[PDB]
């Protein structure tokens, strides 16, 4: 009989005050949480944030919502949550978030005979994540998600992960175009402010970037042009037109790479690991052309010395460029 | 007993009139304010504004909400704020702001037995900031945030920082990848409009741009190419193909840097300090190509005069470029 169920629910909401937490003036109400990560949409270095979609469930017990005689879990309409008390949980490090509302508002209420309440939500949040791009594109990131109560201290509310380390699910199925999730952790602690001490729940991911792509697109073209500038050392110094044209075109080609990759690379201005490599290769092509000027100046009066300089330039330049790579990779890998 | 607490809260709001300010007709109500800054998301030179996320606490006293017999501070639900009087505080220079509302609206009401009301909000605002980009990228900005009462005058309401210089906390949390927080000040004053006078509170920061990025990407490539154009003076003047190709390719390379730099830097439609330097280098490479044309025109009939011009060019060109940098850097630093 659905008329009997209607009376039971209406009796619960009669005299129910939503301004008072359960066990007001008594022990703090324990709230358990768990998250199902639907997806991680985009990770942006420019804006220093990432987008997250998840199913956020909260668990708590309210003795004011205890019913008897109905051996069922009442899954009521989602509009009844506006007449109950719910925790004031907010995400401490989010820039913009919302609850999906198509076709109806994505919300769940599921009462239990003993007064327990299950409160589910579907949220798309854009949490902030500061990044250390010194080693870009060989960097490793650690983006977090902080969960905290807004108005109630530890004297009123408490947080814990429901199920221990198995609270968060779906992380293993997440695929990112540019990163790769390595590990995730769950942290529970208390945070002290001027007003008081607040419960805290933390979820963090460790992101490792994929370096294989950057080898072909970025590092390989710069290396080939640097090797191509060494061809001038194998041309006789009397061919002024050939060596100058080769020397200055590689410089022009090196600037084209720098001024066109920065458009593709994120526009966050400060020195990165890739910038030091491109500038390092820019010096070698610059010195290769500057070396010929020394030879072309003394080849008419000192042919023996000019030939000797070209012989040594065929060894010093390839050898020094190998030392530059060896120091670079060890310092960054 | 939760029933007793419900009676007290209902008694306070019974007959309460939200349309009348506290202590109506008497002394002005003092509203102490303190701000806890969360982060400064971004600073934009194109739109001349910065995005700020903060905790905005307001602290006044209303005798109508005084209660006795309850030795506790009533931390009520955030939905009770709609039934109380709150100041009409607004930010004068804000362009787009909102209160976070996931999972609930980030709002707080905490009453005290004497009638003191603590009212906190979590607000993300995009305040306008006039910028003087003449000295860009060596500039130093000063962005502000204006707090003012829209309706009431100085006789009705008063604003003051709660705690003096300790009112604003969390300045060290600001991590701008491009700027560096140098100083922040707190100002209290009065403002007169055509419709009356209003109290004013001001929070202002001072920002200094980081110059490390512009050295690698902008200044260094331009200096090396300008140096690379001096190689022409060390090549025998009968090698027309070598000196012309070197001279005209540096001009082409210099234009590539300038044209592909305005497409990456923020589009600031007036003259800055970075345009003067690039235009100065473009003149030097342009003059180095004119020098050879004069040499190429007179070397057949006056071999001595053409050779003399080449020797003096090896000294004058490097020397006058040093004066250009010495004047430029000292003026802008």
């Amino acid at each position, epitope marked *: 009989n659905m008329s009997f169920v209607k009376e039971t629910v209406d009796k619960l909401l009669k005299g129910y005050d939503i301004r008072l937490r359960p066990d007001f003036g008594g022990p703090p109400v324990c709230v358990g949480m768990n998250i199902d990560i639907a997806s991680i949409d985009m990770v942006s270095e420019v804006n220093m944030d990432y987008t997250l979609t998840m199913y956020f469930q909260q668990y708590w017990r309210d003795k004011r919502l205890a019913y008897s005689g109905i051996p069922l879990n009442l899954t009521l309409d989602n509009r009844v949550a506006d007449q109950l008390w719910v925790p004031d949980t907010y995400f401490l490090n989010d820039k913009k978030s919302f609850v999906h509302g198509v076709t109806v508002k994505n919300r769940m209420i599921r009462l239990h005979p003993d007064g327990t309440v299950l409160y589910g939500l579907r949220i798309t949040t854009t949490a902030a994540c500061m990044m250390d791009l010194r080693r870009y594109p060989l960097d490793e990131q*650690n983006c977090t998600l*902080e969960i905290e109560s807004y108005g109630y201290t530890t004297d009123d509310i408490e947080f814990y992960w429901r199920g221990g380390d198995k609270a968060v699910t779906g992380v293993e199925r997440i695929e990112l175009p540019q990163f790769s999730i390595v590990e995730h952790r769950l942290v529970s602690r208390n*945070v002290v402010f001027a007003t008081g001490a607040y419960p805290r729940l933390s979820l963090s991911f460790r992101l490792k970037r994929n370096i294989g792509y950057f080898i072909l697109q970025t590092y390989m073209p710069s290396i080939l042009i640097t090797i191509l500038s060494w061809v001038s050392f194998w041309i006789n110094y009397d061919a002024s037109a050939a060596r100058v044209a080769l020397g200055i075109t590689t410089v022009l080609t090196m600037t084209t790479i720098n001024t066109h990759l920065r458009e593709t690379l994120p526009k966050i201005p400060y020195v990165k690991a890739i910038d030091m490599y491109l500038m390092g290769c820019f010096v070698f092509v610059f010195l290769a052309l500057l070396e010929y000027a020394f030879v072309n100046y003394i080849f008419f009066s000192q042919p023996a010395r000019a030939a000797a300089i070209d012989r040594w330039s065929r060894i010093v330049f390839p050898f020094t460029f190998s030392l530059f790579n060896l120091v670079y990779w060890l310092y960054y890998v | 007993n939760m029933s007793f607490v419900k009676e007290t809260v209902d008694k306070l709001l019974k007959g309460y009139d939200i349309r009348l300010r506290p202590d109506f007709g008497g002394p002005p109500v003092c509203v102490g304010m303190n701000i806890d800054i969360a982060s400064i998301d971004m600073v934009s030179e194109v739109n001349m504004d910065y995005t700020l996320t903060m905790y905005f606490q307001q602290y006044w006293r209303d005798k109508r909400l005084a209660y006795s017999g309850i030795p506790l501070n009533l931390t009520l639900d955030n939905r009770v704020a709609d039934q109380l009087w709150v100041p009409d505080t607004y930010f004068l220079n804000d362009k787009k702001s909102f209160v976070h509302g996931v999972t609930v609206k980030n709002r707080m009401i905490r009453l005290h037995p004497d009638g003191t009301v603590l009212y906190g909000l979590r607000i993300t605002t995009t305040a306008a900031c006039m910028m003087d980009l003449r000295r860009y990228p060596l500039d130093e900005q000063n962005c502000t945030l204006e707090i003012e009462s829209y309706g009431y005058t100085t006789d009705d309401i008063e604003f003051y920082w709660r705690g003096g210089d300790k009112a604003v906390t969390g300045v060290e949390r600001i991590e701008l990848p491009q700027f*560096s*927080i140098v100083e922040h000040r707190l100002v209290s004053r009065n403002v007169v409009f055509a419709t009356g006078a209003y109290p004013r509170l001001s929070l202002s920061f001072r920002l200094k741009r980081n110059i490390g990025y512009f050295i690698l990407q902008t200044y260094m490539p331009s200096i090396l190419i300008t140096i690379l154009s001096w190689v022409s003076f060390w090549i025998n003047y009968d090698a027309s193909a070598a000196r012309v190709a070197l001279g005209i390719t540096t001009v082409l390379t210099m234009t590539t840097i300038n044209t592909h730099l305005r497409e990456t830097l923020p589009k600031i439609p007036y003259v800055k300090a970075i345009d003067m330097y690039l235009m100065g280098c473009f003149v030097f490479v342009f003059l180095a190509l004119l020098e050879y044309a004069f040499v190429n025109y007179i070397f057949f009939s006056q071999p001595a005069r053409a050779a003399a011009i080449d020797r003096w060019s090896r000294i004058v060109f490097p020397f006058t470029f040093s004066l250009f940098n010495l004047v430029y850097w000292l003026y802008y630093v």
Partner: nanobody
Framework: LRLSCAAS????????MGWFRQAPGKEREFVGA????????SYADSVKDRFTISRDNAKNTVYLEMNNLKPEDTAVYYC??????????????????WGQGTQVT
């Protein structure tokens, strides 16, 4: 008297360094804090204009320049690291990693 605090490891996840002193008869007291990158500093009221804090990222060191010392400043000085979203700055509980006790008289 110039105390220095040196850090290594994942120093980016803990961008704030703080100094605390523990009285023999009282509890830990806040002294000052320094951001690793920005350089902005905060000081306790009793030690304003007498102590100066600065840092360098060349070797990951935080400097505590002590001036106008007084006999009442006898306590064990600690160096601590605070997370990015650890909350308040004047409360020792929010700090995770605590350095070895150092005594200065």
């Amino acid at each position: 008297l110039r105390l220095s605090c040196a850090a290594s490891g994942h120093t980016f996840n803990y961008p704030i360094m703080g100094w605390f002193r523990q009285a023999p008869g009282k509890e830990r007291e806040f002294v000052g804090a320094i951001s690793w990158s920005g350089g902005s500093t905060s000081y306790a009221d009793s030690v304003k204009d007498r102590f100066t804090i600065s840092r360098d990222n060349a070797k990951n060191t935080v400097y505590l320049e002590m001036n106008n010392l007084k006999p009442e400043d006898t306590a064990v000085y600690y160096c601590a690291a605070k997370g990015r979203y650890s909350g308040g700055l004047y409360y020792p509980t929010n700090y995770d990693y605590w350095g070895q006790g150092t005594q200065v008289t």
